[PDB]
Amino acid sequence: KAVVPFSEANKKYVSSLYRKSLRTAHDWINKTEFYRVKASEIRSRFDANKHINDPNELKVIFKETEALLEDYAHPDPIIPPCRPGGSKFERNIPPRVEARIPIDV
Amino acid sequence: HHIHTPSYIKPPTGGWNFTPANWKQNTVLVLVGFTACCVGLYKLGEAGSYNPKLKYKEEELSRWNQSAK
Amino acid sequence: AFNLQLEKEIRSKIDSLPKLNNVTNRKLSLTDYLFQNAANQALYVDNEADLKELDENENEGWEKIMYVGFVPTMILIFAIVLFKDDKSIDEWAMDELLLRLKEKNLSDVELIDELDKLSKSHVGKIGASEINKRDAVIIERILNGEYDQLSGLKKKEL
Amino acid sequence: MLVQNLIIFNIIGIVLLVLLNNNNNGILNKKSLLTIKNELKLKQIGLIISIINILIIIENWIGFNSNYYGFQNIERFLNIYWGIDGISLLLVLLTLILGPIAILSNWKNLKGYYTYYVISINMLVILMALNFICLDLVSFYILFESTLAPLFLLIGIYGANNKNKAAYYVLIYTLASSLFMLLSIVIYYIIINSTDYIYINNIILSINLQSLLFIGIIIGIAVKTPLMPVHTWLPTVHSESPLGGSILLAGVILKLAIYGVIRLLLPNLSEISMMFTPIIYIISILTLIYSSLITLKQTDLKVIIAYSSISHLAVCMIGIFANNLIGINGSLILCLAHGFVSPALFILVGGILYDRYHNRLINYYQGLSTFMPIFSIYLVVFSFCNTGTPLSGNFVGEFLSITGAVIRHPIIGSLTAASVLLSACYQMKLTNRLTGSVFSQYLHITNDVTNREIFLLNWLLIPTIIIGIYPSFVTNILNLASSTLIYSVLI
Amino acid sequence: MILLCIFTPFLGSLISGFFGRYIGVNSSKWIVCLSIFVSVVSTYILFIDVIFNEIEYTYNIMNWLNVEYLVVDWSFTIDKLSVSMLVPVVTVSFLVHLYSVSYMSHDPHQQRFFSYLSMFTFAMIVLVTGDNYLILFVGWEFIGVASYLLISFWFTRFNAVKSGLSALLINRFGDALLVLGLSYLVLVTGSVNYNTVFALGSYLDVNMITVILICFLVASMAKSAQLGLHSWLLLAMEGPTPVSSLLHAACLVIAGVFLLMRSSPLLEYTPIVLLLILWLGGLSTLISGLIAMVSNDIKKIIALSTMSQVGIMMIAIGVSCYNLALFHLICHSFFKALLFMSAGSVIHSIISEYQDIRMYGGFRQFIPLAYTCIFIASLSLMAIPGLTGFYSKDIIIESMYGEYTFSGFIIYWFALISATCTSLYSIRLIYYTFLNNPNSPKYIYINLKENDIVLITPMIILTILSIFGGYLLRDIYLGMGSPFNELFIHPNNLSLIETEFSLPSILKVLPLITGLGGGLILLLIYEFNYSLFLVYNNKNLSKLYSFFNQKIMFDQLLNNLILRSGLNIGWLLNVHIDRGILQLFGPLGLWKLSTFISSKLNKLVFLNIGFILEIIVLSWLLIVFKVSLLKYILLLIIFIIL
Ligand SMILES: CCCCCCCCCCCCCCCCCC(=O)OC[C@H](COP(=O)(O)OCCN)OC(=O)CCCCCCCCCCCCCCCCC
Ligand SMILES: CCCCCCCCCCCCCCCCCC(=O)OC[C@H](COP(=O)(O)OCCN)OC(=O)CCCCCCCCCCCCCCCCC
Ligand SMILES: CCCCCCCCCCCC(=O)OC[C@H](COP(=O)(O)OCC[N+](C)(C)C)OC(=O)CCCCCCCCCCC
Ligand SMILES: CCCCCCCCCCCC(=O)OC[C@H](COP(=O)(O)OCC[N+](C)(C)C)OC(=O)CCCCCCCCCCC
Ligand SMILES: CCCCCCCCCCCC(=O)OC[C@H](COP(=O)(O)OCC[N+](C)(C)C)OC(=O)CCCCCCCCCCC
């Protein structure tokens, strides 16, 4: 679908793209003081393109952004233990609560 | 805590934090049972075991080699 | 034990509830299934269907047969493989081998001494084991000569 | 005494059940008294008859001599000579033990006509049991094919949705192939004027005639084990036949092919069997490997177990065609061990899950251990028996069969060891899924294994482990009988 | 006494397995711990009798296989090699069971866990004490059975379920080769008994010896996670940490080493196999350490260290130095179980229960006792002089150079790098978890507290064993001329003396310099110059980092190529054979043929005078025609059917 800047569906696409940018920075950079420098550099690059009207510019930028995010993706991201993909995910799931149906077998 | 559905799921191992009310009584019986035939293992082992390096004298083995020669 | 007077009570009470799907003092014997009149057999089922209608996985009718006929049958099979006085061919051959050693070495004082004191239960336990027995000369004599007679049956060579 | 009593008693049992249950057909429209509780009394009489048949073979077992060479209990009945040796004695007892199990597995999961089913089960058991005690080729063929008549009707009446397809498959695959075996039997009776076991065992035929006779017999045997590429009837028949039909098919019927090799090929066509062994090994090895890889892609629970049976019976065929005692004993023990584990896996897959959910698609079942822990224990235990884990009779059968193949043919017999890996690949892929993850969203929680289904599983597991730990109970009986099958002239 | 050492853990398995419902969670754990401890005291009593007094024990229960000449008995014998193997197994098993009492106290299923853990212990005792190879194979298989149930213990977790299957199937691949080696042993020697087979080692054909031990080598790779069959090892981390502390220390990962050391009377008479063991061990030491330097899960890092150290045992076996391999096998079980235990201590202590070292940092003060155990265990792992790892690992690395062959020289550098990489990934693990700036939330550090005394006690006991143990036991296994006839060394292969006297003094300290010197340089970069480790900048560094973090891309290659094509072959057979040509040459194909033929014949039955008169008169040609034309008439008739 075409991109309409300043729309609600554009404030969710850029926001998610910014999340994946910062998470990828966090996976690669494991020191908090070093992460803040990279986190601000990423944000300033978002601020530069913040005021753009032409969708024909945004789609060129949006396609390029995913090229960088996919290229810089960490092969081993950081996942919380109980989240999907974590070390404790689906461990000791409580059983389903439902009355047993008796059968004659 | 949670719901373990213990009404009908009673596996031999217990099913989600199962400790019966009479667990002290049963534990002594099992400890007696474990100890009783743990000695039975010892009594059997001492009777049945042997040293395979002392069953035949070295003089008996020299005759075997020559006879089989 | 049909007890027709008892069914009439059972039949009537189910009639006190016209609605449907909305006793332990009852039993039958082997002679009843073949000798009751056709009228009475109809009554018993009409109650049995309705008694069961007014209702886990027990008293199914097989437990007595399998635990009086089948499990003792497997026990008897287990006993036979355990305590039946049957020699196999490999167990016979070891006994025959010791017998021929005795016959070839009658003039042997040492060997016959061990053969006589070698009990029948330890014949298959020859060698190193927990039993303290003297078979050193017995093993010595088997290693010396060959006590089989296979060469005496193949009278044709190349 | 054995055959005469085993036939006369069962005829009286067949007639007794017919007389009781058919005395009221004549527009009585009554309610009877034997029809109550799904014909409980008629079921119980047939159950008792099956157990008594096990008692008859025992009375003749007490007098069996394991140190006698030749057939024992030699009897004449219906102008036919009947005899038993070490090999036959164990297969008869295996056949009769499964009789009560087949009846009890279908104790309450038939839509009706319980008297017919019980008679057919007892009729199938006796005909198969009598096939191990006949002493001529024609009597072997008569009992080999007589089972088709009740088995065809058993599938078509009590079968699943595709029962019509399965009934035709078993009748046509087995009858057409056995007629080729009949051609070889007719040739024996023409040139030798007898089909007696001992008479034909001493005759050496021309190497060209032995080839034609071997091919005729092997066609009938290869379809009934089954071997590739004539195996396509078995998965269809197993998925649609009733539970008792699957137990007898997977426990006895397939073992008649191995006994066919023992009687109809090894002692009479000895010279040509050595020629055919490389061909037999190639066919069996590819049967083992192909069936294991095909089993991976299956989606039906009862078809997965059906393909598992083909892989292990290829190993039995490999062992029996080894020309040594290790392979022959290993093949026979594997036949008995399979005769208990394979019916147990059909009870777990097609007798417990199917009786509760009536669907054999693999996609509906997972995480069963959450609400069926007892089922999961037996499922896991029998899965490791089915892959030849040590302490099970399957391993003792498999290890000696593989060892016998290696001794027979060191190069190509070594491929038999793929049974160890491939059997665990498809069997533990199914078990890891039924016992894995969250309890399935497509299932409602219901009862666990009942007392009857526990009883069936326990008494199929017990013989497997007793044989696995102390197989000398079986090897002592087989030792002198198996040693007669070896053909070699060492100079 | 011998029956007590072997079967007592099996009774503990049964009690928590079937009587767990009746004695409850608390008493089930301790009674199983009681059964293992009885085996501990029994083993120590037997250790004195066997090693120090040259007494052998043998209990022959009954016969197992009695098929003609092949006779296999249910016999268990305890000799120097067997009783030495029980020392790591039973001791570490006891200290892992006691560890699991408090570690698993929050788990809803504890009776089942201690049943599998004790059943695993019994199987390993069976493997090392059986009198023949078949009894070893019984323990060999049930170790894989128990490992499958332990790795998939949390069976609602999809990852644990598929990891348990992965470990079982790869080991079952090794079992299939082990069975073939046993079948070939029966073919060549007629026996599987150790006493028979080992007496014939010198007189048997080299090719027959090579075939049997190549089969043993493949089985050894699967269990010991050597290169090629090592993929399941890191998937085994899906199980509870006590499983990892046991499987990877004195258990299944060491079973492959034992099988090769047991077969030394045969293995010495085939140099080609020993050469393969040398290279396969050398490759796995190098690869494991390189992967472990860029790994981020704390248990994966320790698991890769286990693979690296087992490969150190393989190179020792390759140069026929069986005594060094057995000694390093015993010592490794002590400080590697400690490292797994002290890793599980940190994971429990942090309230988020993270396992990623990138989310750790600044833990040294808050958990000082856990840090001390890791520190000492790492130094023992790093073969710091004076410690137990120093007396067992330094000699093995130097023995590669003491071989003075081409292969020995190559593998010395592989071992040297692995020795250097061992220091590198140990310091990196310690820095990230303990010495780095805090990466966790502030709430984590105010709640970061040490665990109870039941968790602590086994770690202290193993900590002392990781300090002194190697020095005390060195002379039993490494002393010159010490009699260990179970481990046979051919006189042509004795290299312990040129190893001890001919090496340069620079090589005597070269592993120590690179590890200590390299470790300090690595530590400085993290603390002061971390900008060099932002490898996402450089594209070549990112690709080199990604290659090792993804474990030499082996798991991808195995799943995407070998496993995918293995399942696709079954699909092709299913589609084109079973549902394909066998239906065309079967029911579906014959149904179409029958329908075509029967439709033709149905058109020939109709009441018509002319039709039947023509056929009657046509048949008269059979009388006129000469009989040689019958087959042409037969061909013509089949044409008309079409
Ligand atoms: C889940 C299903 C439930 C069933 C699970 C458990 C199944 C039952 C376990 C036992 C299996 C049955 C096998 C034992 C039956 C007895 C076999 C026997 O007859 O032993 C005879 C043996 C030697 O015979 P002989 O010297 O001739 O003297 C007797 C003369 N009649 O004389 C003897 O010395 C007897 C010695 C018997 C020793 C006890 C055997 C029990 C099993 C313990 C050993 C098992 C092997 C060790 C495996 C450990 C793991 C590697
Ligand atoms: C491992 C298992 C082994 C068991 C398998 C044994 C069976 C193997 C035989 C396989 C051959 C049959 C299977 C394939 C036949 C398919 C028939 C067919 O499709 O019809 C072909 C054609 C009609 O065309 P149509 O089908 O409509 O469309 C074309 C589709 N492409 O019409 C035709 O062309 C059909 C040809 C005309 C009929 C020729 C008749 C020749 C003689 C009869 C053959 C059998 C002889 C038996 C003799 C004794 C009989 C008592
Ligand atoms: C060992 C050699 C034995 C040979 C004798 C065979 C049995 C004879 C049965 C005749 C009486 C009868 O048709 O009776 C019918 C009985 C029982 O049916 P039911 O459920 O009561 O009928 C329903 C009545 N209701 C509605 C009141 C409940 O069916 C049987 O018995 C079936 C056995 C034969 C099946 C296989 C046929 C194969 C034919 C070719 C064999 C080679
Ligand atoms: C050398 C031979 C050893 C023989 C004795 C070993 C101990 C036996 C333990 C029996 C009790 C048990 O484990 O089965 C019962 C437990 C039940 O789970 P729970 O922990 O009570 O939790 C209950 C909560 N659910 C319901 C969510 C699980 O498991 C299961 O159903 C889990 C499924 C896997 C089956 C495991 C079978 C293991 C058999 C070993 C095959 C060789
Ligand atoms: C000689 C080597 C061993 C072979 C043993 C015999 C195997 C015979 C093939 C199986 C046939 C079958 O089972 O017949 C059953 C099948 C059932 O077909 P269906 O699945 O319901 O599909 C058919 C319906 N549709 C497509 C609409 C879904 O009826 C047929 O097709 C009818 C043709 C019968 C031909 C039988 C001739 C047998 C000759 C045997 C020697 C060449």
Q: Which residues of D227-253 are buried (b: 16+ CB within 10 A; e: fewer)?
A: bbbbbbbbbbbbbbbbbbbbbbbbbbb
- With vertex at residue D253, the alpha carbon angle to CA D214 and CA D339, rounded to the nearest 5 degrees, is 115
- Two tokens at D436? 């894995």
What's the rounded Cα separation, in Å, for the pair D221 and E8? 49
Residue E221 contacts residue E41 (beta carbons within 8 Å): no
User: What is the SS3 assignment for C129?
Assistant: coil
Rounded CA Rg of chain B:
27
What's the rounded Cα separation, in Å, for the pair D393 and D396? 5
Measure CB to CB from residue D67 to each of C38, C81, C88 and give the nearest one: C88
A92 Cβ contact partners less than 8 Å away, ≥ 6 residues apart: E107, E108, E154, E156
Query: Nearest Cα to E303, choosing from E319, E325, E288?
Result: E288
Query: Nearest Cα to A34, choosing from D313, E479, E48, E526?
Result: E526
Cβ of residue A105 closer than 8 Å to a chain C Cβ: yes
What's the rounded Cα separation, in Å, for the pair E617 and B24? 104
- With vertex at residue E57, the alpha carbon angle to CA E51 and CA E63, rounded to the nearest 5 degrees, is 145
Residue D464 contacts residue D300 (beta carbons within 8 Å): no
Residue D132 contacts residue D144 (beta carbons within 8 Å): no
* Amino acid identity, position D487: Y
Cβ of residue C82 closer than 8 Å to a chain E Cβ: no
* Amino acid identity, position D418: A
- Two tokens at D474? 């079986």
What's the rounded Cα separation, in Å, for the pair E299 and E209? 39
* Residue whose CA is at the smallest distance from ligand 1 atom 11: D466
Residue E189 contacts residue E271 (beta carbons within 8 Å): no
E406: left (phi over 0), alpha (psi -120 to 50) or beta: alpha
Q: Which residues of D413-422 are buried (b: 16+ CB within 10 A; e: fewer)?
A: bbbbbbbbbb
| Strands D80-84 and E70-78, bridge-based pairing | unpaired
Q: Identify the DSSP state of E130.
A: B
Q: Please confirm whether the linkage preceding D226 is cis (ω < 30° from 0).
A: yes
C-facing residues of A in 84-103 (CB < 8 A) are: 102
E628 Cβ contact partners less than 8 Å away, ≥ 6 residues apart: none
What's the rounded Cα separation, in Å, for the pair D348 and B54? 53
**Phi, psi angle pair for D70, to nearest 5°:** 125, 175
What's the rounded Cα separation, in Å, for the pair E185 and E179? 10
| Strands E57-67 and E70-78, bridge-based pairing | antiparallel
- With vertex at residue D52, the alpha carbon angle to CA D48 and CA D58, rounded to the nearest 5 degrees, is 155
What's the rounded Cα separation, in Å, for the pair E352 and E361? 14
Residue E24 contacts residue B23 (beta carbons within 8 Å): yes
What's the rounded Cα separation, in Å, for the pair D244 and D351? 9
What's the rounded Cα separation, in Å, for the pair E29 and E114? 6
D135 Cβ contact partners less than 8 Å away, ≥ 6 residues apart: D71, D74, D80, D81, D82, D83, D196, D197, D198
Q: Identify the DSSP state of A94.
A: P
- Two tokens at D367? 């995480």
Can you list the alpha helix ranges (DSSP code H) found in E365-452?
368-381, 388-401, 406-430, 442-446
Helix (H) or strand (E) holding D491: none
Q: Which residues in chain D have Cβ-Cβ distances shorter than 8 Å to E583?
A: 232
Q: How far is CA A5 from the centre of its chain?
A: 20
- With vertex at residue E618, the alpha carbon angle to CA E615 and CA E619, rounded to the nearest 5 degrees, is 90
Helix (H) or strand (E) holding C127: none
Q: Please confirm whether the linkage preceding D229 is cis (ω < 30° from 0).
A: yes
Q: How far is CA A15 from the centre of its chain?
A: 9
| Cα nearest neighbour of D105 on chain C | C62
Experimental method: cryo-EM
Q: Give, in order, the Cα–Cα distances in Å from E9 to each of D87, E36, E121.
A: 40, 5, 7
**Residue of B24, B34, B35 to mutate for E, most E C-beta atoms under 10 A:** B34
Q: What is the resolution of the experimental data for this entry, in Å?
A: 2.9
Pocket flag, ligand 4, residue D378 (CB < 6 Å) = no
- With vertex at residue C8, the alpha carbon angle to CA C4 and CA C10, rounded to the nearest 5 degrees, is 110
Residue C65 contacts residue D48 (beta carbons within 8 Å): yes
Cross-chain residue pair E115–B4, CB shorter than 8 Å:
no
- Two tokens at E350? 């942090």
Cβ of residue E199 closer than 8 Å to a chain C Cβ: no
* Amino acid identity, position C132: N
What's the rounded Cα separation, in Å, for the pair D311 and D295? 9
Cβ of residue A30 closer than 8 Å to a chain E Cβ: yes
- Two tokens at C131? 């039993």
For A16, how many CA atoms within 13 A lie in the half-sphere containing its CB? 7
Residue E405 contacts residue E412 (beta carbons within 8 Å): no
Q: Can you state the percent helix, strand and coil of chain C, rounding each to 5? A: 60, 0, 40
Measured N-to-C along each axis, helices E206-224 and E133-151 cross at an angle, to the nearest 10 degrees, of: 20
Cβ of residue B43 closer than 8 Å to a chain C Cβ: no
E523 Cβ contact partners less than 8 Å away, ≥ 6 residues apart: E427, E431, E435
What's the rounded Cα separation, in Å, for the pair E20 and B14? 6
Helices (H) and strands (E) in chain D, counts: 21, 2
Helices (H) and strands (E) in chain E, counts: 32, 2
* Residue whose CA is at the smallest distance from ligand 2 atom 5: E585
Measure CB to CB from residue E165 to each of D168, D407, D432 and give the nearest one: D432
Cross-chain residue pair D439–A102, CB shorter than 8 Å:
no
Residue E313 burial (10 A CB sphere; 0-12, 13-18, 19+): buried
For residue D194, the tally of other CB atoms under 10 A from its CB is 14
What's the rounded Cα separation, in Å, for the pair B14 and B2? 16
Residue E243 contacts residue E343 (beta carbons within 8 Å): no
- Two tokens at E145? 């059975």
Query: Nearest Cα to D330, choosing from D150, D482, D218?
Result: D482
What's the rounded Cα separation, in Å, for the pair E120 and E126? 10
